[PDB]
Design an enzyme around this catalytic site. Sequence first.
Site, PDB file in Angstrom:
ATOM      1  N   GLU A  46       0.285   0.074   2.412  1.00 42.66           N
ATOM      2  CA  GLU A  46      -0.846   0.695   2.384  1.00 42.66           C
ATOM      3  C   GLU A  46      -0.532   2.216   2.531  1.00 42.66           C
ATOM      4  OE1 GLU A  46      -3.655   0.483   1.305  1.00 42.66           O
ATOM      5  OE2 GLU A  46      -4.073   2.592   1.804  1.00 42.66           O
ATOM      6  N   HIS A  54       2.157   4.367   4.466  1.00 48.83           N
ATOM      7  CA  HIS A  54       1.887   3.448   5.667  1.00 48.83           C
ATOM      8  C   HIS A  54       2.191   1.960   5.167  1.00 48.83           C
ATOM      9  CE1 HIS A  54      -1.078   0.272   7.168  1.00 48.83           C
ATOM     10  NE2 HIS A  54      -0.053   0.363   8.289  1.00 48.83           N
ATOM     11  N   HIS A  56       2.264  -2.124   6.412  1.00 49.13           N
ATOM     12  CA  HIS A  56       1.352  -3.203   7.213  1.00 49.13           C
ATOM     13  C   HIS A  56       2.224  -4.666   7.018  1.00 49.13           C
ATOM     14  CE1 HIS A  56      -1.782  -2.876  10.085  1.00 49.13           C
ATOM     15  NE2 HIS A  56      -2.698  -2.541   8.866  1.00 49.13           N
ATOM     16  N   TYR A 100      -6.658 -12.210   5.001  1.00 48.47           N
ATOM     17  CA  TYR A 100      -5.758 -11.034   4.507  1.00 48.47           C
ATOM     18  C   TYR A 100      -4.345 -11.363   3.792  1.00 48.47           C
ATOM     19  CZ  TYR A 100      -1.504  -7.923   5.733  1.00 48.47           C
ATOM     20  OH  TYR A 100      -0.567  -6.983   5.767  1.00 48.47           O
ATOM     21  N   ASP A 104      -3.553 -10.904  -1.676  1.00 50.91           N
ATOM     22  CA  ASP A 104      -2.190 -10.612  -2.195  1.00 50.91           C
ATOM     23  C   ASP A 104      -2.384  -9.498  -3.104  1.00 50.91           C
ATOM     24  OD1 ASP A 104      -2.653 -13.465  -2.535  1.00 50.91           O
ATOM     25  OD2 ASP A 104      -2.779 -12.702  -4.637  1.00 50.91           O
TER      26      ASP A 104
END
Length: 118
Positions: A46, A54, A56, A100, A104
């Site tokens: 992300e 970023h 995750h 989450y 995908d």
Amino acid sequence: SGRFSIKAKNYFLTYPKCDLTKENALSQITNLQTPTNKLFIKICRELHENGEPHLHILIQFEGKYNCTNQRFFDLVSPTRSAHFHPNIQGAKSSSDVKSYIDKDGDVLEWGTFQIDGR
């Protein structure tokens, strides 16, 4: 009068402005031993609105893993002599993880997740 001790079945690793790849983190994380056992591993990338990359990560162990040390998830750059300290977070109970996980797309998937219950 307190110590940093995390206890949860699922853990979330967040790498701020981390140029670390999911492959390296996947290999490192996957190679990362635990007092329990690694089941599923979800790695999604992300980008922050701050222009910083970023990362995750969502892992779930068979048993409640105790992450009372931010040295186990210590990921470093295999291409650069730089170390990165990700934020360890204990994910309580909730299927939100599955939601989450199902989300995908341009992400890496390892292991097989399993929801406890009926």
